[PDB]
Amino acid sequence: NPGTVDVLHWWTSGGEAKAVETLKQQIQKDGFIWKDNAVAGGGGVLKTRAISGNPPSAAQIKGPDIQEWGALGLLTELDDVAAANKWDDLLPRQVADIMKYDGHYVAVPVNIHRVNWLWINPQVFDKAGAKVPTTLDELFAAADKLKAAGFIPLAHGGQPWQDSTVFEDLVLSILGPKGYHAAFVDLDEKTLTGPQMTEAFATLKRLGTYMDPNRAGRDWNIAAAEVINGKAGMQIMGDWAKSEWSAAGKVAGKDYQCVAFPGTQGSFAYNIDSLAMFKLKDANDIKAQNDLAKVALEPEFQTVFNQNKGSLPVRQDMDMSKFDACTQKSAADFKEAAKGDGLQPSMGMATTLAVQGAIFDVVTNFLNDPQAEPATAVKQLNAAIKAAR
Numbered sequence: 190n191p192g193t194v195d196v197l198h199w200w201t202s203g204g205e206a207k208a209v210e211t212l213k214q215q216i217q218k219d220g221f222i223w224k225d226n227a228v229a230g231g232g233g234v235l236k237t238r239a240i241s242g243n244p245p246s247a248a249q250i251k252g253p254d255i256q257e258w259g260a261l262g263l264l265t266e267l268d269d270v271a272a273a274n275k276w277d278d279l280l281p282r283q284v285a286d287i288m289k290y291d292g293h294y295v296a297v298p299v300n301i302h303r304v305n306w307l308w309i310n311p312q313v314f315d316k317a318g319a320k321v322p323t324t325l326d327e328l329f330a331a332a333d334k335l336k337a338a339g340f341i342p343l344a345h346g347g348q349p350w351q352d353s354t355v356f357e358d359l360v361l362s363i364l365g366p367k368g369y370h371a372a373f374v375d376l377d378e379k380t381l382t383g384p385q386m387t388e389a390f391a392t393l394k395r396l397g398t399y400m401d402p403n404r405a406g407r408d409w410n411i412a413a414a415e416v417i418n419g420k421a422g423m424q425i426m427g428d429w430a431k432s433e434w435s436a437a438g439k440v441a442g443k444d445y446q447c448v449a450f451p452g453t454q455g456s457f458a459y460n461i462d463s464l465a466m467f468k469l470k471d472a473n474d475i476k477a478q479n480d481l482a483k484v485a486l487e488p489e490f491q492t493v494f495n496q497n498k499g500s501l502p503v504r505q506d507m508d509m510s511k512f513d514a515c516t517q518k519s520a521a522d523f524k525e526a527a528k529g530d531g532l533q534p535s536m537g538m539a540t541t542l543a544v545q546g547a548i549f550d551v552v553t554n555f556l557n558d559p560q561a562e563p564a565t566a567v568k569q570l571n572a573a574i575k576a577a578r
Contacts, residue, residue, distance in 0.1 A: 192473030193222045194481045195245040196464065201229050204432065208494035215484050221477035232350070233542060239263050244467035246478040250296065251462050252538050258465060259290030265468040267294035270479045274486065279504050281523075283532055287461060295465055297485045300500040302460035303519050304427040304535040305358055305453045308413070308434075309446040313340055313422045322451045325362060325392060332399045335422040343396065344412035344421035347405035349549035351412075355396065355425050356552045357536040359389045362452035366530040369458075373539040376578065381571045390555060390563035397556055409433075416445075425450060427460060427535075431499030431515060441514030449522065457526035458535040461503070547573035 194216050200209055213223040226245075235248055240263075250258060258264055271277070271294045277285060280298070288296045307328075309321055314331070317338035322328040332342035345351065361369045364385050371380040380386060404412075413433040415421040424430065434445055441447075449456075466482060469475055484490060491502040492511055501512075501519050509520050526532040537545065551569045555561040 190471065190473035191220045191222060192471065192475070192477030193224060193246070194474075194477045195224050195226070195247075196481065197235060197245045197248040198225070198227060198464070199229060199231055199233075199249055201227060201231070202498075204497040205494070207497070208490055211490050211493055212481070212484060215489075216477065216480060219480050221473075221480060239467060244469070246469060246474060247464040247466050247481060249462065250465040251460075252534075253541055255287070255296050255463070255465055256290060259295050263467060264290065264295035265466050265475075265478070267297070267466060267479070267482055270294075270482045274483055276486065279486065279506060281503070281505060281527060283527070284459075284461065284503055287534075287538075288463065296463045297466070297482045298461050298463045298503045299485055299491075300462050300495050300498075301503050301523070302427050302429060302462075302500045302535075303522070304354065304458040304460050304537075305361055305450040305456065306426065306428050306430075307448050307450050308416060308424045308426060308430055309448060310416050310419060310422055311442075311444075311446055313416075313419055317422065319422060321446065321448060323448070323454065325359075325451050328451045329395070331422065332396075336399065341401065341415055341421035342399040342423070344415040344424045345400045345404060346407035346409050346412045348408070349553040351409055351426075352553045352556050353536065353545075353549050354427065356389065356393055356548075357458065358425055358450040358453065359392050359396075360386070361456060361458055361533070362450060363389050363392065366456045366533050369456075370530070370533055373536045374534065376540075376544070376574055378571055381574065382567045386567050386570070387563045390566045393552070393556060394561065394563065397559075428499045428515065428519060431513065432497065435497060435499075435513075445515075447515040447518055455526065455529075456531040456533060457523050458533055459523075460535045460537055541577070543577040544574055547577040 216223050238244060276294060284298055288294055288298055314321060317335050317340060319331045319334040320327060322331050335342040360372060368380060368385060371377040409426055409430065410433045412424050413430050416424050417434060417437050439445055464485060466478055469478060486504065491504050495502045496512060501516055509517055551566065551573050555566045
């Protein structure tokens with residue numbers, strides 16, 4: 190036909206086009222047709238279109254949104270392409286499991302972000318006599334010292350997802366991997382209303398006190414800029430924030446440092462993006478689909494897509510010297526975490542959009558209220574999470 194690949198995705202950026210193009214050019218070269226329809230409003234009509242027999246060949250669906258679409262029977266089993274390309278050998282076990290439904294590949298993963306980073310301006314630290322933290326006590330001690338030296342201690346933007354990034358970090362730090370998993374994967378009631386979650390909010394509140402009150406609306410890349418430009422000391426963010434650093438022409442260690450969010454050493458909170466493959470009717474369109482799935486997990490796209498963006502590739506067998514120094518620390522930390530309970534889904538991997546919304550809402554509401562009681566915030570957390578489920 191020669192068969193058509195229609196991919197619904199949100200990879201809008203110029204850096205992400207380089208990779209998408211490498212995909213297109215190879216599909217064409219393999220004798221198939223390319224077509225895309227790239228929407229925007231990042232964060233996530235496809236349903237109505239797939240529940241009515243006009244799906245795209247592929248769509249961007251991260252988190253649990255895969256199990257739901259699988260369970261509807263709308264996705265296609267990729268046993269053949271998996272088998273031909275030794276997918277089980279290439280993927281970390283926990284990653285492969287996220288991509289399966291009834292033991293069958295239904296989606297191909299394309300990246301691994303780490304959520305639990307702190308980004309550090311080593312020039313700002315030296316001029317402030319500040320010490321790169323490894324504990325929460327030390328994170329505050331650095332914050333004080335930066336303020337005392339007349340820097341913005343924490344660069345932080347006014348969007349709910351960013352408030353909860355910082356929250357989920359604190360949950361991980363205080364509760365450790367197991368408790369984090371109890372809270373965001375199992376939505377365990379005792380955990381979400383317990384003393385340590387309460388401590389996570391108390392610590393959130395306390396981080397609040399060092400944040401700019403005129404942050405409302407502000408994007409993560411503006412907060413990163415305050416760090417890049419030598420005006421702030423730190424930002425707590427996932428490793429997408431490297432893009433901002435790259436685009437400014439920085440390096441690894443010479444301009445910034447990446448450390449694990451204090452107290453989360455040992456753990457890797459992953460954030461994994463993916464293309465779920467729909468059940469199609471045309472044989473040629475299947476062959477195209479299977480090609481897109483193969484190539485999305487080949488070295489060429491796995492390198493370009495994750496490069497100039499900050500995430501790790503999901504393939505285990507990569508030439509990592511192709512990446513920056515922070516991605517190499519991220520690759521090392523991944524493996525350590527992977528030996529045990531340390532590897533956990535970020536909150537964004539770990540629940541439904543409705544539950545996220547509930548948490549985002551509780552967190553921002555409590556962080557935007559200087560009188561808010563942590564003892565109260567855990568009841569709000571739990572009650573909202575119950576209601577969204």
